[PDB]
Inverse folding.
DNA sequence: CCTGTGACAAATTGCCCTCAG
DNA sequence: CTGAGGGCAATTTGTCACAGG
């Protein structure tokens, strides 16, 4: 049963926001949204090194490294919602540790309604589905794909490439499409195919000499 | 203009070790 | 013993010159 892992349920506004974060910063982001979901919430969240190591198959010393550098790298990271245009900071206070092996973070109290969206306008996935991805961009794509998933784990969706560049905030050399192909599309599609239960194919949409959309579709291995 | 590949750079990976308390 | 530190080589991500349709 896929039901063994936490159920991540985020608003589609988050699924579609424009931001940069590392794999490690996102692994934590999942744990934070879970914890608001279980409370009039105020923004204080807690992380235990020992538990984070259970969850991601890591050693105690390595989990401490990953948390400690992620938490430092939130400084100056804005998140932008869209159309619409609203920019917020993730943390309003620096994180700190009062007990050995435990950190206390203060997430911005305005983001919470953006996490807990309006009814039937939301994305959802088990934590197991995404814990073995490595590339953060491959994590963004798996999120967006999940947004279109029917009850039976199948779906089809067309994303415009300029929109992928803006929301996933991809590096500049990928505006030149042979590089986008080689260092993002093939790498992220292979990863979903090897690390998740999803089975993914795609076709490109040219207009004139240009490529403008990727047309993704997928079934679940439970077929 | 469009494409793919080779090369170099800079970054991320899981892993090894000391050491404090 | 846990976990806060330092460090590593190997691999993957990011940049871009060159050659062909
Ligand atoms: Mg990153
Ligand atoms: Mg609390
Ligand atoms: Mg690491």
């Amino acid at each position: 049963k896929r039901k063994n892992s936490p159920r991540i349920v985020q608003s589609n506004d988050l699924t579609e926001a424009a931001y940069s974060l590392s794999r490690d910063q996102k692994r934590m982001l999942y744990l934070f949204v879970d914890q608001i979901r279980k409370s009039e919430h105020d923004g204080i969240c807690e992380i235990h090194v020992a538990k984070y190591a259970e969850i991601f198959g890591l050693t105690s010393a390595e989990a401490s490294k990953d948390i400690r550098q992620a938490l430092k790298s939130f400084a100056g990271k804005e998140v932008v919602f869209y159309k619409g245009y609203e920019s917020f900071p993730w943390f309003i206070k620096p994180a700190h540790s009062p007990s050995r092996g435990l950190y206390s973070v203060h997430i911005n109290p305005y983001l919470i309604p953006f996490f807990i969206g309006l009814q039937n306008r939301f994305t959802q996935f088990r934590l197991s589905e995404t814990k073995e991805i490595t590339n953060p961009y491959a994590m963004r794509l798996y999120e967006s794909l999940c947004q279109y998933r029917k009850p039976d784990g199948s779906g089809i969706v067309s994303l415009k490439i300029d929109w992928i560049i803006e929301r996933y905030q991809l590096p500049q050399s990928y505006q030149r499409m042979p590089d986008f192909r080689r260092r993002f599309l093939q790498v992220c599609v292979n990863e979903i195919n090897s690390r998740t239960p999803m089975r993914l194919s795609y076709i490109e949409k040219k207009k004139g000499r240009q490529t403008t959309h990727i047309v993704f579709s997928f079934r679940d291995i439970t077929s």
Observations:
- The first strand of chain A starts at residue 7 and ends at 11.
- Residues A 22, 136 surround magnesium ion (ligand 1) (CB under 6 Å).
